[PDB]
RNA sequence: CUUAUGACCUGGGCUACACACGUGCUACAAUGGACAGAACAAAGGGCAGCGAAACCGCGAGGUUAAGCCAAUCCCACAAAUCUGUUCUCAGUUCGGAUCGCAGUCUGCAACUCGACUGCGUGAAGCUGGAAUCGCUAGUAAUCGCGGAUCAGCAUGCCGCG
């Protein structure tokens, strides 16, 4: 898929894109505005042009693949450095 | 083809000259690739045995075997002769096509693929995996995919040492 | 090869969104793909985006 | 503090400057848990008064983004 | 009791929870969720205080500053509600708690220790056991508004519609 994760085919593009971690409401709407799709369309009914548009937009922007690692790195850092905040994190 | 000529013309001569073998066919060769499914979850889902059998036929036309328990176990609620997992042996153009498909789609399709395990060399010269996702490459029909458990793949080579097997795999394109 | 126990193998042209074409004997007559080997950044050597974002923190002393 | 600048106590900053002008040396005791960690704090094994004792803590690079109280617990159990 | 059961100061605790129970708020959705347009308020406060208007910023808010010791000016464009677009019965376009990051109000400093905003997720939860509570008219239910305590802190209090 666009971000390597399947999206609902029977839903609007706006909310279909939200199922990707890191890409929420504002990010999805901004990507749709950049792509020029009007935000009212089915994802099962699209063409290669606007598909590749969103694909390259996502590849240029941040993705779950990077966020999953960045958040984990930050968490491990703030846990290892002491950081009573990090202590609470480890405690859960 | 697209792999046999590449091998015979780049991997064999280069590796032979690199390792200073005393004969032409002394170069290590990939004998076969065995794919296994491992599951005894069939105990709780008798139809689970059907799963990964229709998927394996699409992954490779070679129909898998319904391997059966060679020994019973109470901890797993097992009895000798009950079906557990599936087996497939690719030898010939099938293994070449499987390697091509894998390298071209499966590894690049994985979301978080980076620096595959270096550990999973046998010591002996074989290389061993358990893909944990059942929808790695396109022939698995994401829509029809219901269960998510991937496949064991076992690469077997005539290499006498792990070092030469590593070199062969890297020259073939294994992104270590 | 047994008779009829296996599906018919067919040569197909594996396609990619970036334009790379690969050929492999597959059940499907054609296979559409989005990320091929070269398309995946790991195969592109040191990826630009990753090599650019992989820098360590500097305490954010810009301000 | 958002744009007024980072935060630190004057006496603690003067102590750290005196200790860093020549070479990092023995612990710098202080009761200023409020102070925020700066790059200058690196290498100095500062001590924090948790209420009944001083806990010496070696401030590494990544500590700049936290306060001394984050490393000076107070409650007991 | 008294060179201490009195007094000064830094920090901590008063805010810890395998727990149980009173009171209140939010939820489990189609009388609904999100977006576009529109109307009506009643009471109270303002001098180191209240602060129009303009600009900046998605935002909480920041800068210049009019006016007001007040039936003048401001706080302060009430929301429910209505007319439309849209989704569709699902742990969901329900709920936003816990949560990571980035910021805003204040203040020497929100780290033990406020609130608020954006980002990305999102569970518990789909009506809840004995039993129990308030309510006879502008009452019940329910939607907003202002003040006390206050540098900065309200689901509680006082009242108003």
Curated annotation (Swiss-Prot), chain A:
Keywords tagged on the record: Ribonucleoprotein, Ribosomal protein, RNA-binding, rRNA-binding, tRNA-binding
Keyword check for Ribosomal protein: yes
Domain of life: Bacteria
GO cellular component, one term: cytosol
Listed GO biological process terms: translation
GO MF terms held by the record: rRNA binding; structural constituent of ribosome; tRNA binding
Similarity section: Belongs to the universal ribosomal protein uS13 family.
Complexes and interactors: Part of the 30S ribosomal subunit. Forms a loose heterodimer with protein S19. Forms two bridges to the 50S subunit in the 70S ribosome.
Task performed by this protein: Located at the top of the head of the 30S subunit, it contacts several helices of the 16S rRNA. In the 70S ribosome it contacts the 23S rRNA (bridge B1a) and protein L5 of the 50S subunit (bridge B1b), connecting the 2 subunits; these bridges are implicated in subunit movement. Contacts the tRNAs in the A and P-sites.
UniProt protein name: Small ribosomal subunit protein uS13
Organism name: Bacillus subtilis (strain 168)
Gene label: rpsM
Entire-sequence positions represented here: 3 to 94 of 121
From Swiss-Prot, chain B:
PROSITE patterns: RIBOSOMAL_L5
GO BP, one annotated term: translation
GO CC, alphabetical: cytosolic large ribosomal subunit
Gene3D superfamilies linked: 3.30.1440.10
A GO molecular function held by the record: tRNA binding
Pfam families for the chain: Ribosomal_L5, Ribosomal_L5_C
InterPro entries cross-referenced by the UniProt entry: Ribosomal_uL5, Ribosomal_uL5_bac-type, Ribosomal_uL5_C, Ribosomal_uL5_CS, Ribosomal_uL5_dom_sf, Ribosomal_uL5_N
Keywords: Ribonucleoprotein, Ribosomal protein, RNA-binding, rRNA-binding, tRNA-binding
Membrane-spanning residues: none
rRNA-binding listed as a keyword: yes
Primary role: This is one of the proteins that bind and probably mediate the attachment of the 5S RNA into the large ribosomal subunit, where it forms part of the central protuberance. In the 70S ribosome it contacts protein S13 of the 30S subunit (bridge B1b), connecting the 2 subunits; this bridge is implicated in subunit movement. Contacts the P site tRNA; the 5S rRNA and some of its associated proteins might help stabilize positioning of ribosome-bound tRNAs.
NCBIfam families: PRK00010.1
Similarity section: Belongs to the universal ribosomal protein uL5 family.
Oligomer status and interactors: Part of the 50S ribosomal subunit. Part of the 5S rRNA/L5/L18/L25 subcomplex. Contacts the 5S rRNA and the P site tRNA. Forms a bridge to the 30S subunit in the 70S ribosome. Interacts with VmlR. In stalled ribosomes contacts MutS2.
Protein name (record): Large ribosomal subunit protein uL5
Gene source species: Bacillus subtilis (strain 168)
Gene: rplE
UniProtKB/Swiss-Prot annotation, chain C:
Assigned protein family: Belongs to the bacterial ribosomal protein bL31 family. Type A subfamily.
Organism from which the protein derives: Bacillus subtilis (strain 168)
Function: Binds the 23S rRNA.
Record-level GO cellular component terms: ribonucleoprotein complex; ribosome
Name of the protein this chain belongs to: Large ribosomal subunit protein bL31
Binding residue positions for Zn(2+): 16, 18, 36, 39
SUPFAM superfamilies recorded: L28p-like
Co-factor binding comment: Binds 1 zinc ion per subunit. This zinc stabilizes the protein.
Taxonomic lineage: Bacteria, Bacillati, Bacillota, Bacilli, Bacillales
Keywords: Metal-binding, Ribonucleoprotein, Ribosomal protein, RNA-binding, rRNA-binding, Zinc
InterPro entries the UniProt entry points to: Ribosomal_bL28/bL31-like_sf, Ribosomal_bL31, Ribosomal_bL31_A, Ribosomal_bL31_sf
GO terms for biological process, alphabetical: translation
Gene Ontology MF terms: metal ion binding; rRNA binding; structural constituent of ribosome
UniProtKB/Swiss-Prot annotation, chain D:
Cystine residue pairs: none
Biological function: Protein S19 forms a complex with S13 that binds strongly to the 16S ribosomal RNA.
Subunit description: Part of the 30S ribosomal subunit.
Protein name in the entry: Small ribosomal subunit protein uS19
GO-annotated biological processes: ribosomal small subunit assembly; translation
GO cellular component: cytoplasm; small ribosomal subunit
Family classification: Belongs to the universal ribosomal protein uS19 family.
GO MF annotation: an example: rRNA binding
Gene that specifies this protein: rpsS
UniProt KW keywords: Ribonucleoprotein, Ribosomal protein, RNA-binding, rRNA-binding
């Amino acid at each position: 898929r666009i971000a390597g994760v399947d999206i609902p085919r029977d839903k609007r593009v706006v909310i279909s894109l939200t199922y990707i971690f890191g890409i929420g409401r504002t990010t999805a709407q901004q990507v749709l505005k950049e792509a020029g799709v009007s935000e009212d369309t089915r994802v099962r009914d699209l063409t290669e042009e606007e598909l590749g548009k969103i694909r390259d937009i996502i590849d240029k922007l941040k993705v779950e693949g990077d966020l999953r690692r960045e958040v984990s790195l930050n968490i491990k850092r703030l846990i290892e450095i002491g950081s009573y905040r990090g202590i609470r994190h480890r405690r859960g | 083809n697209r792999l046999k000529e590449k091998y015979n013309k780049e991997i064999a001569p280069a590796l032979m000259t690199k390792f200073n073998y005393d004969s032409v066919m002394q170069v290590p060769k990939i004998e076969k690739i065995v794919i296994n499914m491992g599951v005894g979850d069939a105990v709780q889902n008798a139809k689970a045995i059907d799963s990964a059998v229709e998927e394996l036929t699409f992954i490779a036309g070679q129909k898998p075997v319904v391997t059966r328990a060679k020994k019973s176990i109470a901890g797993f609620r097992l009895r000798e002769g009950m079906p557990i997992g599936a087996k497939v042996t690719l030898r010939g153009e099938r293994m070449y096509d499987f390697l091509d498909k894998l390298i071209s789609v499966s590894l690049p399709r994985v979301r978080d693929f980076r620096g595959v395990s270096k550990k999973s060399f046998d010591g002996r010269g074989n290389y061993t995996l358990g893909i944990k996702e059942q929808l790695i490459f396109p022939e698995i029909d994401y829509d029809k995919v219901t269960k998510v458990r991937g496949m064991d793949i076992v690469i077997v080579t005539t290499a006498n040492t792990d070092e030469e097997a590593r070199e062969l795999l890297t020259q073939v394109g294994m992104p270590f | 090869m047994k008779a009829g126990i296996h599906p018919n193998f067919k040569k197909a042209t594996v396609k990619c969104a970036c334009g790379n074409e690969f050929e492999t004997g597959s059940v499907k007559e054609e296979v559409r793909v989005e990320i091929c080997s070269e398309c995946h950044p790991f195969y592109t050597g040191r990826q630009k985006f990753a090599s650019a974002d992989g820098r360590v923190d500097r305490f954010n002393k810009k301000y | 503090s958002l744009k007024k600048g980072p935060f630190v106590d004057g006496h603690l900053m003067t102590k750290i400057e005196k200790l860093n002008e020549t070479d990092k040396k023995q612990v710098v005791k202080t009761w200023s848990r409020r102070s925020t960690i700066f790059p200058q704090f690196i290498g100095h094994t500062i001590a924090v008064y948790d209420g009944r004792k001083h806990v010496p803590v070696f401030i590494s690079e990544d500590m700049v983004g936290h306060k001394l109280g984050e490393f000076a617990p107070t409650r007991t159990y």
